[PDB]
Design a protein around this nucleic acid. Structure first.
Lengths: 228, 263, 147, 221, 241, 209, 268, 297
RNA sequence: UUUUUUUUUUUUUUUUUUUUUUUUUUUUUUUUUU
């Protein structure tokens, strides 16, 4: 609701208990609540957090991500979520109906869709290819062919969680496609023809370069006319 | 690299009375070598030595005209060993020793390098070791000895006295003069218990207690003498009577080696 | 820390500092690691043994944390990064690490801080508990016996 | 006045560009990322700082600038939020705005401001805000000049750099991060210089707040 | 002021415009020092090449699980010219460029993917140098690699062509290289495809195809000579052993 | 030089028996140290040595310790790199025979010698070798490194000989220039110097507890 | 057979199946090495003229310990890669699971030791796996080491032989040779001390002289490029008794004479 | 990490798009990127932009002593040191790596060895005093093609620079201040420009070496994504007098000679336009400065 | 017509710049068309 800076006064009554979200720090020495990020402060048993702009992903539990297999070990895979970042681990038993005879068959260089399950501060993060909380398996696994697009984190959140974001609807009015959205800043698309996939890639890149959601339709029309 | 049992067996064989060498050689016997000379046409002299275990060295000799008042040393040696850094300790130690053995007054007759009352020849010695398995001081010394006895230099045809009126030195365009300088030889010895060995092999160097470096020139022992460690896991002290024994051994058996390097 | 072992660095061998000079102030201002400055890229490898401030390294395997139930040990419930631990040498290991154990009543954590090193010091309360004095919060460790 | 721009490079986490008179610096930030094994710290974030000059290659003159920048930046960052990670910070000086053979304070102030802007743009947790100004004292007149030009530096008697720390909406001074004085001065001059510098730094930090809010707000919903 | 190309069609050393220098090569010259070796003589050039490997890597960092690592080292001695060199050439940018070019040439030809977790080392010593040294290096590397029994797709041959006003001259020496611009080529097998192309001085744009064709024909002849020598050595080796 | 301030490029440099004192343990940030100072009629020398180790070493496992010796100039740069490295190699050869290296697996020992002062009050590096040996022996004993014997040396007419076991054994021999037929006299003179140096070293170790 | 060179067309018949040393494009088969053409039914391949030793299951090899690892050893046998010796592939004097021996592996084998082993299996890339689970394998002592190229070792059913003069030879398939004094086990062929570094305290001078002579004649046979067998070794040893001094056998003419005499005697 | 990871899907997609005559950014196979050049306040300060690649250059000079061997010439040097500012895959101090050495050698051969600068005009007093000129290249953002951008920036900066006027007063010299005696420019003999080509194999190695067809693919001025998947590379330098300044193809995928000649012929059309653009921009900058100076009278 | 499920191994980067060199000389008045 308001724009805040690091070191500013926190506008919350000290008596009422509020759960803390991203961008807010509790001092371990003075037990004081202060903001450490720049952006917009949202206050909703009520929760407060700051919405700030970022490009570098930090793992958090219950996030949907897209990774690349970079190494195979005796009992697990080595997975990268972003260039120049520390790797995460994916266990051989983290697949549906997995056993010591039903081994996975992924190779170095494959794309995977997974969920973050463990993000301890003193350890290496872990991912799984099925929702263990609910037992649901909705789209988790290998992504064949297609193309990958890099975006910032706010754009990916807007695509995944906001149903009034108009990009998917305007894209569906030109072609039929498959999509997977990762909160680490990755988008995967695939169409039946390569020209349609290329047009989708160009449209998504150009729309992410801009900030106005009202110009998406014109961009899509121009890009899909360009490929003839 | 050897194991404990191998080293114990070899040391027991070598430190016996009489000594038993692994290939059955006598305490003063050398191994066969092959010598080639005059195979680099662009140099004043050259040689190549091949040892029986694969060791190989190549030497080149080149010259330049300098003012022998500003220039103090007319012989310079440069050493290159494949697989070693240019500033490695062994490379610089060998370079220092080889420059010391060929100094101005050491038995090397530097009066044969003089042209005109003002100028002289300066000799450059370049050494390249292609492959080696032990301390290559004596191999390089033998190669230098072979190369220096087949060197030819340009012949001066333009005056000799130029103290008052000086003319640029000028040389004959086809003829050359053989250099008849007197080069020395360097030997390495191994100490195994109470015995002294000439020309030790790689496996004999891994069990030796100590080593000696002795220089030789025209019938006499020459100044540069050092004690050297041929390994780091078995180096120990030795009694003074082993030094005299080594000096006598070199004095006795050096002339035979000279005849083997002739021509 | 990982799921299988803990990595440590040796600071003192029988109440004698090792090495004598820790290299403090060699990299300038701020908080820098020993090999995190400009001199780390110009160290003469072939003319010395190691660089300024380097220490011996060790490894504690999870099966060596204690002598009993050495198949259900959780490493993060025993140690945290930044703790001071007293251990005993088991083997010389390879050229990189020694092998250490804490499977005795007098071995374990002697100094620790709250909030993973951002808070104040804690004091040992039980065989498996430490307490923060300013705020009565407790954490789990493998406490070495005091007194 | 000063001109500042945010988010101008494509392959880094954050970037900025600061201009003050004839001094121009561009800075970039990448982190948190995986460090080398010899840079790692068990409980907090590690820093790698590089400064490059406008002409020639880097020498020992830039090492002092790197040292002072590291001294200023270390207490600003909430380092305990990123255990055993790395942050790379690189500053390129495009125009010195002074005679490099004698003076280096304008470059230091511009680098401090540019690095703070890039850290804000990247998304790193920060304890508070910062601002830095250069000051000089001129001969004969013995007047204290805030933001001196290159001509006024050639006839100066002492040169100073001041960097302060602000909290609570940019109205409360928390600490003095850096004061660097070189020349000849007495106590009264020093305590007048501090009083003037505090007000100038407050004005600068207010301006910086306005610029940041203008640049960042369109990116959010 | 010399007659580089006389009106009678003769060069300074007596050759004609499309003639190679004397070409002599030997194989298996250093059996005790390397797996493969060769000794190359091209005019007054003298080069020793040694091939070590495939073998265990020295460090665990230089290990690849999909293919082998290839390294090339070139040593140019201080006595390889008429005038002695003042300083060493070990760390010059020119030598590093030569080494990188050779590695990138031979990466595509050697089947490195059938020797995972190994290293192959090439060490080269240049004793005498009289022009056109890059082509001689290429030929020596090819011969030494084949002598070591390492799988490859085809031969690579090196050649140099100089352009004197309007006259192309094949396989130039030091005197010609100091008076005109030259082109160095690396040709694969008996085809028209080039692995290396190196031009360091100015050449008119409308005069390059003819030079390329002349160089390609010369490289084919060089490949023929190398193949003949290899077959003769193999016949002698298998005849008695 | 990017790491040093060397000044303008166009500048040119300006062109124009023995009594001993031994002390140990005065440097705080090392393991052992010694100061050797010798005076006579026509010479004067001062030396400082420092020992670092045993310390960690880079590489693969080694079953015994490794020794490194570094020689540095002082005040005046009177020697070049090659001769200093040759003397260092000779000293390393000597001290590989007296240190009990089997006691220190996978570790290194680094020794530094500073040539602080050398003045002629009324062939020059050979006469400096005995004092280096004495200083290194004293510093190694101060640091607590195991030695099988106390090593000394003597100098006589360009010949240096190092002894152990009361002068009945030789651990190092050096000879440059000099007379070719003079070997027994050199040995006797070097041993005579060695005995005095050994007495002084033992007294220094025993008194300064 | 037929000698081919890299890049040479071998056949254009679309009936052959391609093996090692070849590459193909459609129906054209080419050579990737210099060697000879080999045909087995419908399989076509090229055998290189030169190469390193390639281990095979069941081989008897001699190697040196290179690295001490995590429950394993690395052994150098002269191939393109090091071999692997697992801790479970050796015999331990006391036991495997006593209520150590994983952190104390250097008390049995350490860097530089020589040992006798057999190839158990090959990995995916051709590297070997070794085992020492018999009384005929283990640490080597009481003798000397020598080396010849592996292509000169004639394939046979047995590789350990007893020679006149109380000498035993172990002929490694990879070309590594061990000469030693004959023991009780060797005579019978025709617990904690198996990892001991001590030699026999009763090795006499005659045995040392015999070992020197055997090493010299083996080197002489290798110089003439004659395959090494037990019968040839004995014949060359007996024919060298003309020279009373063992040290005269290192000259080139003597070595060539010994080899030529062996060949002439065999051919007659 | 310092490794840029590429998945199999991305490689397959880009290669298949190349098979159908598609580039990700919409260019054709023989289209060069647009070039923007901006001049700073001082002489010799130039910024060059090529799509997303940004490069900055600076020129400076000072008094020095000539070499003993060559007493009639001045000194010229070019420095190109890369930093993690252009991308986290670049080390801070690395002048020995393969790509850095190759780029440095190519720039040196194109500019300094070809004699584009008149170094005999830098001599003040023969044998004792001369000028030393420096070129410093700063890499700000990498999207491919540092070599071409660096060449353009260095040449434009050299053509924009001016040095102070001096006079010889007996034994010593006098360097006049800029506000006194109108600094003077350098002499440029020719203007070289570099072009880079990238090669891709849509088949296997056997088809490339033993095949009859030549189906290799060539594109001009690759981006960062494209140049991480290429099999070969070629750089050629040319001037408007139809001279080949240098050619560099240091290994890689073998290419037929006719295709290489076609590449060399395609580069000339680009260099002509680039030369004209640089000359026009310099003329406009000079006119702007003269007009402002007149208006400030 | 009972009975018959076989599948081997590995963890966190070698240290010090750009210069990278051969075949020999001369002599006293603007501008255009010639």
């Amino acid at each position: 609701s308001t724009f805040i800076f690091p070191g500013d006064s926190f506008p919350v009554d000290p008596t009422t208990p509020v759960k803390l979200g991203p961008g807010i720090y509790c001092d371990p020495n003075t037990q004081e609540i202060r903001p450490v990020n720049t952006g917009v402060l949202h206050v909703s048993v009520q929760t407060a957090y700051i919405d700030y702009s970022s490009k570098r992903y930090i793992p958090s539990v219950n996030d949907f991500v897209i990774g690349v297999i970079i190494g195979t070990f005796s009992d697990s895979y080595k997975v990268s979520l972003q260039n120049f970042s520390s790797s995460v681990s994916l266990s051989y038993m983290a697949f549906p109906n997995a056993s010591k005879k039903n081994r996975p068959t992924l190779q170095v260089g494959d794309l995977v869709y997974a969920r973050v399950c463990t993000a301890e501060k003193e350890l290496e993060a872990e991912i799984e290819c099925f929702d263990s909380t609910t037992g649901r398996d909705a789209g988790f696994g290998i992504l064949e062919d297609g193309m990958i697009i890099d975006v910032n984190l706010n754009f990916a959140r807007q695509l995944l969680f906001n149903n009034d974001f108009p990009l998917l609807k305007v894209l569906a009015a030109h072609t039929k496609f498959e999509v997977a959205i990762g909160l680490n800043g990755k988008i995967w698309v695939k169409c039946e023809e390569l020209s349609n996939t290329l047009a989708c890639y160009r449209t998504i890149m150009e729309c992410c370069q801009k900030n106005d959601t009202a110009a998406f339709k014109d961009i899509a029309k121009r890009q899909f006319k360009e490929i003839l | 690299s050897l194991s404990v049992a191998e080293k114990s067996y070899l040391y027991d064989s070598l430190a016996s009375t009489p000594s038993i060498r692994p290939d059955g050689r006598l305490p003063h016997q050398f191994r066969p070598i092959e010598i080639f000379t005059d195979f680099l046409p662009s140099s004043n002299g050259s040689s190549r030595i091949i040892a029986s275990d694969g060791s190989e060295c190549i030497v080149s000799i080149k010259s330049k005209v300098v003012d022998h008042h500003v220039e103090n040393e007319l012989l310079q040696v440069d050493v290159d060993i494949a697989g070693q850094r240019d500033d490695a300790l062994v490379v610089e130690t060998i370079t220092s020793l080889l420059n010391k053995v060929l100094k101005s007054g050491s038995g090397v007759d530097s009066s044969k390098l003089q042209l005109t009352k003002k100028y002289s020849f300066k000799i450059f010695v370049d050494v390249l070791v292609i492959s080696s398995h032990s301390h290559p001081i004596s191999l390089i010394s033998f190669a230098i000895y072979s190369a220096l006895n087949s060197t030819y230099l340009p012949k001066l045809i333009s005056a000799f006295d130029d103290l008052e009126v000086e003319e640029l030195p000028t040389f004959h365009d086809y003829d050359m003069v053989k250099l008849d300088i007197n080069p020395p030889l360097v030997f390495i010895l191994a100490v195994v218990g109470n015995n002294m060995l000439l020309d030790p092999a790689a496996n004999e160097s891994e069990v030796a207690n100590n080593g000696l470096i002795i220089s030789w020139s025209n019938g006499k022992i020459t100044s540069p003498i050092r004690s050297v460690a041929l390994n780091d896991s078995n180096v120990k002290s030795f009694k003074p009577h082993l030094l005299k024994q080594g000096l006598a051994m070199v004095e006795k058996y050096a002339p035979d080696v000279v005849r083997s390097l002739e021509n | 820390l990982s799921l299988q072992r803990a990595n440590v660095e040796i600071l003192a061998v029988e109440d004698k500092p090792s090495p004598i000079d820790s290299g403090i102030g060699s990299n300038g201002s701020g908080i820098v690691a020993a090999g995190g400055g400009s001199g780390a890229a110009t160290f003469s490898v072939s003319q010395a043994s190691s660089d300024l401030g380097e220490t011996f390294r060790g490894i504690i395997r999870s099966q060596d944390v204690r002598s009993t139930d050495r198949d259900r040990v959780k490493v993060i419930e025993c140690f945290k990064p930044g703790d001071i631990v007293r251990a005993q040498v088991l083997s010389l290991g390879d050229g990189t690490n020694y092998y250490l154990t804490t499977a005795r009543n007098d071995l374990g954590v002697v100094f620790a801080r709250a909030a993973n090193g951002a808070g104040g010091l804690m004091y040992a309360t039980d065989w498996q508990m430490m307490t923060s004095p300013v705020t009565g919060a407790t954490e789990k460790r493998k406490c070495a016996k005091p007194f | 006045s000063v001109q500042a721009e945010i988010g101008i490079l494509d392959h880094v986490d954050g970037s900025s560009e600061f201009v003050s008179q004839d001094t121009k610096v561009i800075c970039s930030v990448t982190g948190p990322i995986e460090p080398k094994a010899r840079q790692e710290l068990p409980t907090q974030l590690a820093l790698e700082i590089i400064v490059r000059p406008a002409k020639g290659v880097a020498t020992t003159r830039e090492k002092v600038l790197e040292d002072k920048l590291r001294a200023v930046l270390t207490p600003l960052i909430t380092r305990h939020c990123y255990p055993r990670q790395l942050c790379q910070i690189t500053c390129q000086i495009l125009e010195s705005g002074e005679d490099e053979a004698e003076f280096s304070l304008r470059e230091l102030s511009c680098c401090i401001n540019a690095a703070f802007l890039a850290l804000v743009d990247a998304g790193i947790a920060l304890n508070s805000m910062c601002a830095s100004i250069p000051i000089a004292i001129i001969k004969d007149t013995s007047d204290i000049i805030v933001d001196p030009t290159a001509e006024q530096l050639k006839i100066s008697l002492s040169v100073h750099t001041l960097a302060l720390e602000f909290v609570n909406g940019g109205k409360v001074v928390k600490n003095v991060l850096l004061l660097d004085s070189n020349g000849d001065f007495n106590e009264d001059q020093l305590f007048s210089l501090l009083e003037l510098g505090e007000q100038k730094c407050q004005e600068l930090v207010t301006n910086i707040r306005r610029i940041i809010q203008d640049n960042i707000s369109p990116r959010l919903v | 002021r010399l007659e580089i190309y006389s009106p009678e069609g003769l060069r300074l050393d007596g050759r004609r415009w499309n003639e190679l220098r004397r070409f002599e090569s030997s194989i298996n010259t250093h059996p005790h020092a390397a797996d493969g070796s060769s000794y190359m003589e091209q005019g007054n050039n003298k080069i020793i090449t040694l091939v070590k490997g495939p073998k265990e890597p020295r460090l665990k960092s230089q290990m690849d699980t999909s293919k082998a690592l290839l390294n090339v080292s070139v040593n140019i001695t201080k006595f390889s010219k008429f005038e002695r060199s003042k300083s060493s050439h070990k760390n010059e940018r020119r030598v590093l460029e030569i080494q990188t070019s050779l590695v990138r040439m031979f990466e595509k030809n050697v089947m490195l993917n059938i020797y995972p977790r190994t290293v192959i080392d090439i060490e080269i010593h240049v004793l005498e140098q009289d022009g056109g040294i890059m082509g001689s290096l290429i030929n020596g590397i090819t011969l030494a690699l084949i002598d070591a029994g390492i799988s490859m797709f085809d031969y690579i041959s090196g050649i140099s062509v100089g352009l004197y006003d309007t006259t192309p001259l094949l396989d130039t020496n030091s005197l010609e290289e100091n008076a005109m611009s030259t082109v160095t080529l690396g040709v694969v097998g008996k085809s028209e495809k080039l692995s290396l192309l190196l031009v360091e001085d100015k050449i008119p744009l409308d005069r390059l195809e003819n030079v390329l064709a002349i160089g390609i024909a010369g490289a084919h002849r060089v490949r023929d000579l190398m193949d003949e020598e290899l077959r003769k050595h193999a016949q002698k080796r298998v005849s008695n052993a | 030089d990017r790491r040093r301030l060397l000044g303008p490029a166009a500048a040119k440099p300006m062109a124009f028996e023995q009594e001993l004192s031994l002390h140990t343990g005065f440097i705080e940030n090392c393991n052992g140290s010694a100061l050797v100072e010798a005076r006579s009629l026509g010479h004067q020398t001062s030396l400082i040595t420092a020992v670092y180790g045993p310390r960690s070493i880079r590489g693969s496992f080694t079953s015994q310790g490794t020794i490194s010796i570094q020689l540095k100039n002082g005040l005046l740069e009177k020697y070049n790199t090659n001769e200093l490295k040759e003397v260092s190699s000779f000293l390393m050869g000597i001290f590989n025979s007296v240190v009990n290296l089997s006691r220190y697996p996978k570790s290194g020992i680094d020794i530094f010698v500073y040539l602080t002062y050398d003045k002629d009050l009324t062939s020059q590096i050979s006469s400096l070798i005995p004092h280096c040996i004495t200083s290194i022996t004293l510093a190694l004993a101060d640091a607590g490194i195991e030695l099988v014997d106390m090593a000394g040396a003597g100098e006589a007419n360009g010949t240096v000989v190092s002894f152990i076991k009361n002068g009945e054994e030789i651990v190092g021999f050096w000879k440059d220039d000099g007379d070719d037929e003079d070997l027994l006299e050199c040995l006797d003179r070097c041993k005579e110097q060695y005995n005095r140096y050994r007495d002084l070293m033992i007294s220094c170790l025993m008194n300064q507890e | 057979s037929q000698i081919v060179t890299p890049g040479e067309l071998v056949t254009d018949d679309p009936i052959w199946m391609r093996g090692h040393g070849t590459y193909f494009l459609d129906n054209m088969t080419y050579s990737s090495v210099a060697g000879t053409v080999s045909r087995v039914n419908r399989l076509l391949s090229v055998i290189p003229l030169k190469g390193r030793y390639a281990p095979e299951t069941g081989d008897h090899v001699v190697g040196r310990i290179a690295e001490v690892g995590n429950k394993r050893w690395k052994v150098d046998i002269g191939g393109k890669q090091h071999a692997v010796l697992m801790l479970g592939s050796v015999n331990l004097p006391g036991g495997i699971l006593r209520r150590s021996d994983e952190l104390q592996m250097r008390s049995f084998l350490k860097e530089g030791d020589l040992l006798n082993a057999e190839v158990q299996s090959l990995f995916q890339d051709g590297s070997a796996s070794l085992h020492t689970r018999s009384l005929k394998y283990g640490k080597l002592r009481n003798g000397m080491f020598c080396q010849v190229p592996s292509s000169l070792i004639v394939r046979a059913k047995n590789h350990t032989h007893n020679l006149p003069g109380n000498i035993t030879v172990v002929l490694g398939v990879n070309g590594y040779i061990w000469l030693r004094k004959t023991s009780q086990m060797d005579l019978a062929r025709d617990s904690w001390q198996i990892y001991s570094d001590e030699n026999d305290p009763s090795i006499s001078n005659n045995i040392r002289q015999a070992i020197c002579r055997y090493a010299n004649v083996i080197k002489a046979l290798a110089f003439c490029e004659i395959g090494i067998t037990q019968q040839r070794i004995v014949s060359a040893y007996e024919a060298s008794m003309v020279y009373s001094n063992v040290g005269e056998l290192i000259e080139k003419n003597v070595m060539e004479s010994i080899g030529s005499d062996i060949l002439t005697a065999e051919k007659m | 990490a310092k490794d840029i990871e590429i998945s199999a899907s991305e490689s397959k997609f880009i290669l298949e798009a190349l098979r159908q005559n598609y580039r990700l950014d919409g260019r054709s196979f023989d289209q060069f990127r647009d070039v923007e050049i901006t001049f700073g306040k001082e002489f010799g300060d130039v910024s060059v932009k090529m799509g997303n690649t940004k490069v900055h250059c600076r020129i400076s000079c000072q008094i020095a002593q000539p070499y003993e061997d060559r007493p009639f010439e001045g000194l010229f040097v070019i420095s190109t040191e890369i930093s993690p500012m252009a991308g986290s895959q670049f080390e801070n101090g690395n002048i020995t790596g393969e790509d850095e050495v190759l780029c440095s050698r190519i720039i040196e051969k194109s500019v300094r060895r070809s004699g584009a600068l008149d170094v005999e005009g830098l001599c003040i007093v023969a044998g004792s005093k001369c000028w030393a000129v420096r070129a410093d290249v700063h890499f700000l953002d990498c999207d491919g093609g540092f070599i071409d951008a660096s060449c353009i920036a260095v040449m434009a900066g050299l053509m924009h620079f001016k040095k102070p006027d001096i006079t010889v007063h007996g034994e010593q010299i006098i360097v006049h201040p800029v506000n006194e005696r109108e600094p003077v420019p350098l002499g440029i003999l020719h203007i070289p420009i570099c072009v880079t080509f990238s090669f891709f194999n849509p088949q296997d190695t056997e088809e490339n070496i033993k095949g009859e067809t030549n189906s290799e693919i060539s594109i001009i001025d690759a981006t960062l994504k494209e140049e991480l998947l290429r099999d070969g590379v070629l750089t050629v330098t040319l001037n408007k007098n139809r001279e080949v300044v240098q050619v560099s193809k240091a290994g890689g995928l073998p290419m037929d000679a006719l295709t290489l000649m076609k590449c060399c012929h395609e580069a000339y059309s680009i260099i002509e336009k680039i030369t004209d653009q640089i000359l026009q921009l310099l003329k406009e900058d000079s006119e702007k400065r003269n007009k402002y100076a007149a208006m400030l009278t």
